[PDB]
Design an enzyme around this catalytic site. Structure first.
Site, PDB file in Angstrom:
ATOM      1  N   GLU A 194      41.202  30.977  41.011  1.00 27.04           N
ATOM      2  CA  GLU A 194      41.850  30.055  40.734  1.00 27.04           C
ATOM      3  C   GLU A 194      40.583  28.828  41.181  1.00 27.04           C
ATOM      4  OE1 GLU A 194      41.631  27.213  43.772  1.00 27.04           O
ATOM      5  OE2 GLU A 194      42.785  26.555  44.247  1.00 27.04           O
ATOM      6  N   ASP A 230      42.654  33.374  45.672  1.00 31.52           N
ATOM      7  CA  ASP A 230      42.271  31.844  45.897  1.00 31.52           C
ATOM      8  C   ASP A 230      40.566  31.536  45.849  1.00 31.52           C
ATOM      9  OD1 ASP A 230      43.126  29.656  47.745  1.00 31.52           O
ATOM     10  OD2 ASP A 230      42.801  30.295  49.273  1.00 31.52           O
TER      11      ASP A 230
END
Ligand SMILES: OC[C@H]1N/C(=N\O)[C@H](O)[C@@H](O)[C@@H]1O[C@H]1O[C@H](CO)[C@@H](O[C@H]2O[C@H](CO)[C@@H](O)[C@H](O)[C@H]2O)[C@H](O)[C@H]1O
Ligand SMILES: *[C@@H]1O[C@H](CO)[C@@H](O)[C@H](O)[C@H]1NC(C)=O
Ligand SMILES: OC[C@H]1N/C(=N\O)[C@H](O)[C@@H](O)[C@@H]1O
Ligand SMILES: [Ca+2]
Ligand SMILES: [Cl-]
EC number: 3.2.1.1
Length: 496
Positions: free
Chosen positions: A233, A197
């Site tokens: 990401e 993330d």
């Protein structure tokens, strides 16, 4: 970090967004394994802030309190049980690792967390890890607010707080070791990989230093020397100093330009048409195939929280969405991720959704179980896109055609396209406002094939459209612009 570590012949992963561990474990056994799904991306398994204003939003899970496996999805025992049962049936587990930050600096001190652990954002104390003020980037950030203010300065995007989220000092070996301890605990339990993330907000070298501390995968299910699958990401739409290519030495990257452009093409925005999809992939300025994790929508942009804008296709745009997911699963570019969502009360006021915070279907805060309806769909407001015939059959199509080249392209210069995947599969689309009725070259052997979009192949017969392929590979396809699904897909295993 580049190989998916999926079982041979299983090519896609599904994001079972906000699902409980006991429901994923059951889903692995009853649906995912029998239907050939490769894996599951789970929501963050680590303890987070229990936000009550607004009532338990989906985003509270992106605000860590500790690394204890104790969330609304379940506890440690339930997580391990899920991982073991899924792996034993060949379905892999991928963890959403929120390692860039802890919670927001404006969050109140106390025990308002998912496992009751104490935390104090103001004094930067997270004793359950343990982390103190010395473990954050407060003295490294040079912005006046302490938050990210300008995306043209590559340094602040990394060293400052993403919308107030306390930024971890990832250059420190102590912080790297604490994150590696968490990730290694998960690898040894049996997870096959991770979604890193907010990777754009972490230095490529800092991520590499954390990955160097990671173990090989659990040797009870994986061969010796298997490295964890890493997909970072990084939201890169171009025109920024930070490029997704800066992260290639660490693993794969999420390609956000994929879902954005497929959305504009299928919606036919700015005069764009499906005939332009001839050189889809690297030719459009996307990252190389072996470094791409592709998807139509994700948990963020399906409710307007990431990037891609209003072009993003979601389950709400059902008819156009199935075509997009169908194209993605048929095209050879990248590794595919299917979205599985929940229904929330969308309310557009001045063009924007005021209910975009709405958390998973719940009963006084407790996430609802995924109940199964007699027609294989889901109840309790779980959309279950992976269970829709058109999407489920396209996941199997990708499995059957794995390794086959991109061949036999056809287009009418507008929005009626078609292509084959070697001698194992063929797909035709009609996104024009008129009917399609033509004989095309397939590359497939002679016989009768069931259309996997309009029906299924149940015991020597088709429940939907039948396609007849001749000796020379030719076949007539007839698609109306009024059809529930304006596309036909046939493969080697749908043959009678
Ligand atoms: O991992 C952090 C973000 N980065 C991500 N990828 O880079 C996640 O995909 C995305 O879901 C995360 O934002 C989500 O999770 C954040 C923390 O909960 C939310 O911010 C929320 O919390 C902040 C600090 O309390 C507030 O300032 C903000 O207004 C409030 O919406 C934010 O809107 C929501 O999109
Ligand atoms: C397939 O279904 C049709 C009726 O739709 C029937 O005429 C035919 O015999 C069936 N084929 C087999 C092999 O049972
Ligand atoms: O810079 C792209 C995009 N990327 C983001 N993270 O990687 C942010 O959450 C979002 O606020 C920002 O606009
Ligand atoms: Ca950072
Ligand atoms: Cl993502």
């Amino acid at each position: 970090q580049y190989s998916p570590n999926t079982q041979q012949g299983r090519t896609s992963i599904v994001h079972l967004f906000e699902w409980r561990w006991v429901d994923i474990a059951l889903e692995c056994e009853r649906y995912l394994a029998p239907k050939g799904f490769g894996g599951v991306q789970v929501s963050p398994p680590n303890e987070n802030v229990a936000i009550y204003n607004p009532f338990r939003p989906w985003w509270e899970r992106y605000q860590p309190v500790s690394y204890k496996l104790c969330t609304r999805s379940g506890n440690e025992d339930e997580f391990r049980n899920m991982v073991t049962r899924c792996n034993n049936v060949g379905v892999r587990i991928y963890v959403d690792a929120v390692i860039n930050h802890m919670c927001g600096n404006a969050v109140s001190a106390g025990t308002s967390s998912t496992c009751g652990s104490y935390f104090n954002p103001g004094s930067r104390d997270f004793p359950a890890v343990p982390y103190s003020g010395w473990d954050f980037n407060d003295g490294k950030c040079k912005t006046g607010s302490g938050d990210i203010e300008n995306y043209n300065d590559a340094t602040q995007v990394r060293d400052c707080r993403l919308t107030g989220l306390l930024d971890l000092a990832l250059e420190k070996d102590y912080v790297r070791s604490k994150i590696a301890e968490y990730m290694n605990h998960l690898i040894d339990i049996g997870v096959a990989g991770f979604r890193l993330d907010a990777s754009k907000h972490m230095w490529p070298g800092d991520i590499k230093a954390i990955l160097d501390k990671l173990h090989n995968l659990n040797s009870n299910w994986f061969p010796a020397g298997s490295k964890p699958f890493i997909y970072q990401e990084v939201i890169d739409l171009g025109g920024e100093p930070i490029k997704s290519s800066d992260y290639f030495g660490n693993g794969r990257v999420t390609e956000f330009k994929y879902g954005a452009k497929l959305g504009t093409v299928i919606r036919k925005w700015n005069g764009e048409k499906m005939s332009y999809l001839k050189n889809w992939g690297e030719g459009w300025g996307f990252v190389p195939s072996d470094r791409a994790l592709v998807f139509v929508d994700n948990h963020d942009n399906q409710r307007g929280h990431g990037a891609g804008g209003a072009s993003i296709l979601t389950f709400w745009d059902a008819r156009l969405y199935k075509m997009a997911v169908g194209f993605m699963l048929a095209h050879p570019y990248g590794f595919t991720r299917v979205m599985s969502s929940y229904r929330w009360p969308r309310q557009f006021q001045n063009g924007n959704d005021v209910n975009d915070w709405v958390g998973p279907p719940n009963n006084n805060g407790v996430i609802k179980e995924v109940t199964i309806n007699p027609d294989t769909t889901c109840g309790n407001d779980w959309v279950c896109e992976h269970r829709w015939r058109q999407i489920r059959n396209m996941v199997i199509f990708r499995n059957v055609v794995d390794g086959q080249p991109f061949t036999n392209w056809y287009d009418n210069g507008s929005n009626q396209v078609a292509f084959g995947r070697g001698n194992r599969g063929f797909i035709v689309f009609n996104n024009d406002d008129w009917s399609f009725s033509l004989t095309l070259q397939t590359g497939l052997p002679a016989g009768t094939y069931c259309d996997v979009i309009s029906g299924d192949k149940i015991n020597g017969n088709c429940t939907g459209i039948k396609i007849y392929v001749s000796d020379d590979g030719k076949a007539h396809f007839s698609i109306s612009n009024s059809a529930e699904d304006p596309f036909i897909a046939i493969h080697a295993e749908s043959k009678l």
